[PDB]
Enzyme design. Structure first.
Site, mmCIF file in Angstrom:
data_model
loop_
_atom_site.group_PDB
_atom_site.id
_atom_site.type_symbol
_atom_site.label_atom_id
_atom_site.label_comp_id
_atom_site.label_asym_id
_atom_site.label_seq_id
_atom_site.Cartn_x
_atom_site.Cartn_y
_atom_site.Cartn_z
ATOM 1 N N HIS A 263 -2.006 1.742 -3.281
ATOM 2 C CA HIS A 263 -1.606 0.590 -2.463
ATOM 3 C C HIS A 263 -2.099 -0.740 -3.058
ATOM 4 O O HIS A 263 -2.533 -1.638 -2.342
ATOM 5 C CB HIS A 263 -2.087 0.778 -1.010
ATOM 6 C CG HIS A 263 -1.291 1.797 -0.260
ATOM 7 N ND1 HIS A 263 -0.048 1.515 0.264
ATOM 8 C CD2 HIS A 263 -1.535 3.101 0.015
ATOM 9 C CE1 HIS A 263 0.435 2.599 0.852
ATOM 10 N NE2 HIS A 263 -0.448 3.577 0.716
ATOM 11 N N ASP A 326 -6.168 5.899 0.488
ATOM 12 C CA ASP A 326 -5.024 6.661 0.986
ATOM 13 C C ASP A 326 -3.870 6.668 -0.018
ATOM 14 O O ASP A 326 -3.677 5.705 -0.768
ATOM 15 C CB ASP A 326 -4.517 6.091 2.320
ATOM 16 C CG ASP A 326 -4.033 4.644 2.204
ATOM 17 O OD1 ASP A 326 -4.747 3.842 1.582
ATOM 18 O OD2 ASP A 326 -2.960 4.297 2.754
ATOM 19 N N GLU A 327 -3.098 7.757 -0.004
ATOM 20 C CA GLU A 327 -1.818 7.825 -0.701
ATOM 21 C C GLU A 327 -1.911 7.364 -2.154
ATOM 22 O O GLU A 327 -1.058 6.625 -2.634
ATOM 23 C CB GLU A 327 -0.746 7.041 0.078
ATOM 24 C CG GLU A 327 -0.533 7.596 1.496
ATOM 25 C CD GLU A 327 0.463 6.808 2.335
ATOM 26 O OE1 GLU A 327 0.571 5.578 2.170
ATOM 27 O OE2 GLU A 327 1.131 7.432 3.201
ATOM 28 N N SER A 328 -2.961 7.806 -2.837
ATOM 29 C CA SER A 328 -3.141 7.533 -4.270
ATOM 30 C C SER A 328 -2.370 8.552 -5.106
ATOM 31 O O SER A 328 -2.942 9.246 -5.967
ATOM 32 C CB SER A 328 -4.628 7.571 -4.629
ATOM 33 O OG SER A 328 -5.314 6.579 -3.886
ATOM 34 N N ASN A 329 -1.060 8.625 -4.865
ATOM 35 C CA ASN A 329 -0.221 9.677 -5.454
ATOM 36 C C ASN A 329 0.051 9.493 -6.942
ATOM 37 O O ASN A 329 0.554 10.409 -7.611
ATOM 38 C CB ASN A 329 1.085 9.806 -4.671
ATOM 39 C CG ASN A 329 0.853 10.120 -3.201
ATOM 40 O OD1 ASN A 329 -0.206 10.627 -2.815
ATOM 41 N ND2 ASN A 329 1.843 9.827 -2.375
#
Length: 507
Positions: A263, A326-329
């Site tokens: 993000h 979060d959401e460190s894809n």
């Protein structure tokens, strides 16, 4: 015995179709006796603490209460430093507090001649004042003078304290920007329902919202947009300090978040050197998530993070700094473990403990002082936090207030399903995680689809009231049928506050 769950109300919401106090969240105890106190134009607020320093703090609390009461009554109630209240007075005191009620607890006893709020600490007087406002007639919460209403409080006895220490609201100001005034208003409104924490999500893919003097293009480039068209915006460090100060007057801790390593597109669009090819990313105005990453193995990344943390720590008195996670894809498991441990070390070196979204608790660099914000709420989430003795803040689907109320909601998302007022009430933090030290609850208002203050109001009210009661009121005392009817009774107060709430058809 026979039981049922609630359906929609025949013929529409009671929050459209609809002596009588309206206390939300439900206090530990509330009894009513015969007789009543009348607030008249001659009333004063008396304050008395255990020493002059404490009396002075109570005095400030008294003045804030007087300002609120004066706005709707048109009176000029003044505040007096004295332990000798006169008949018709409100009296705020910390002398002889019931220690079992803790820092935020209070007794509030109203007789014909006097309103007496007795707490352990100034903080508890402030929380108790939120109840006091709900004991007076609807109309008292108007911001302009109300005529034709007798300002009465029934003879009553209240004792109260919170179940959970952390009862928070997060506002996403990265997806769409909200002004200092808009943010102050949401803090003010939330405070009236005993919310005591405000988490600011200050950065994401579509925008960077906090002035960092050492990296000025974070604002010059990274603040200049938002989701969709818009011009975006940002807070100077002085504006941030103003927000912090405003929250402090309401005994609300502000926890700033700089989300990393994912993000991070807005930072990556501001400084080319943060990217492997050395070029700035294009700014992003869509709503996709998961694709951005800081460079986990470049020292420039950690210099950047340190500069940001240094500046933010200098202006943020909370012992906590939220570093996202979060959401460190686009970040490998190995790099994420390493990255989050390194940035935790930096935060700790600047005297700050780290809050992070799951799975940040799994980082080998976490300490038992780190805090997990458990949003996933699955069987295995927070296994690491539990093993490490980390406090947990829960944010299940039921706390994702940005979700549509219903399939047909005009705004909101639905990747966690729909969250109406009933769903926002009918849960317990112990549902989300077992065997943990649950610090509390945080309602998250993501802003992919909210552009205006009216949009914020529509989603937070009445949903936030449900979450606020889940944080404050003990599970054994919570009951949807009870809350629903109390909420109906409360509706005029939301109206009076100018809140553009949704009249939920399940209420």
């Amino acid at each position: 015995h026979h039981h049922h769950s609630s359906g929609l109300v025949p013929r529409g919401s009671h929050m459209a179709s609809m002596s009588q106090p309206s206390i939300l969240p439900k206090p530990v105890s509330y009894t009513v006796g015969s007789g009543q106190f009348v607030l008249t134009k001659n009333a004063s607020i008396f304050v008395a603490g255990n020493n002059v320093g404490e009396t002075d703090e109570l005095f400030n609390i008294g003045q804030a209460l007087a300002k609120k009461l004066n706005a709707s009554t048109g009176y000029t109630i003044s505040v007096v430093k004295s332990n000798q209240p006169t008949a018709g007075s409100i009296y705020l005191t910390t002398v002889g507090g019931n220690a079992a009620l803790g820092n935020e607890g209070y007794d509030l006893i109203t007789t014909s001649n006097q309103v007496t709020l007795t707490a352990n600490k100034p903080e508890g007087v402030f929380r108790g004042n939120q109840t006091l406002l709900q004991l007076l007639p609807a109309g008292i919460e108007k911001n302009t003078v109300v005529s034709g209403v007798q300002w009465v409080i029934p003879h009553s006895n209240i004792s109260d304290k919170p179940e959970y220490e952390y009862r928070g609201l997060m506002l996403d100001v990265a997806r769409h920007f909200f002004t200092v005034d808009e943010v102050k208003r949401q803090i003010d409104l939330a405070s009236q329902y005993k919310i005591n924490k405000f988490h600011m999500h200050l950065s994401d893919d579509q925008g960077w919202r906090i002035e960092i003097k050492s990296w000025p293009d974070l604002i010059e480039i990274g603040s200049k947009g938002q989701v969709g068209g818009g011009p975006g915006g940002y807070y100077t460090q002085e504006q941030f300090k103003d927000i912090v100060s405003y929250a402090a007057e309401r005994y609300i801790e502000v926890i700033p978040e700089i989300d990393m390593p994912g993000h991070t597109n807005a930072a990556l669009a501001s400084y080319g050197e943060l990217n492997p090819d050395g070029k700035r990313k294009a700014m992003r105005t869509d709503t996709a998530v998961g694709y951005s990453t800081l460079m986990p193995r470049a020292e420039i990344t950690y210099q950047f993070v340190e500069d940001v943390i240094s500046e933010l720590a200098a202006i943020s008195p909370s012992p906590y700094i939220h570093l996202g996670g979060d959401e460190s894809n686009a970040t490998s498991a190995a790099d994420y473990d390493y990255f989050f441990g390194r940035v935790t070390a930096i935060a700790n070196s600047y005297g700050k403990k780290v809050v992070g979204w799951d799975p940040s608790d799994t980082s080998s660099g976490a300490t038992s002082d780190s805090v997990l914000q458990n949003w996933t709420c699955s069987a295995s989430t927070g296994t690491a936090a539990k093993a490490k003795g980390m406090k947990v803040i829960v944010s299940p689907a039921n706390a994702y207030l940005d979700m549509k109320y219903y399939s047909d909601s005009p705004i909101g998302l639905q990747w966690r399903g729909f969250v109406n007022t009933n769903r926002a009430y009918n849960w317990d933090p112990t549902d989300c995680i077992k065997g943990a030290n649950i610090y509390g609850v945080e309602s998250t208002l993501w802003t992919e689809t909210f552009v205006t203050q009216d949009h914020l109001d529509y989603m937070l009210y009445p949903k936030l009231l449900s979450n606020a009661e889940v944080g404050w009121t003990a599970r054994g005392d919570r009951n949807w049928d009870d809350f629903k009817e109390r909420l109906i009774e409360h509706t005029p107060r939301l109206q009076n506050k100018g809140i553009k709430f949704f009249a939920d058809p399940i209420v």
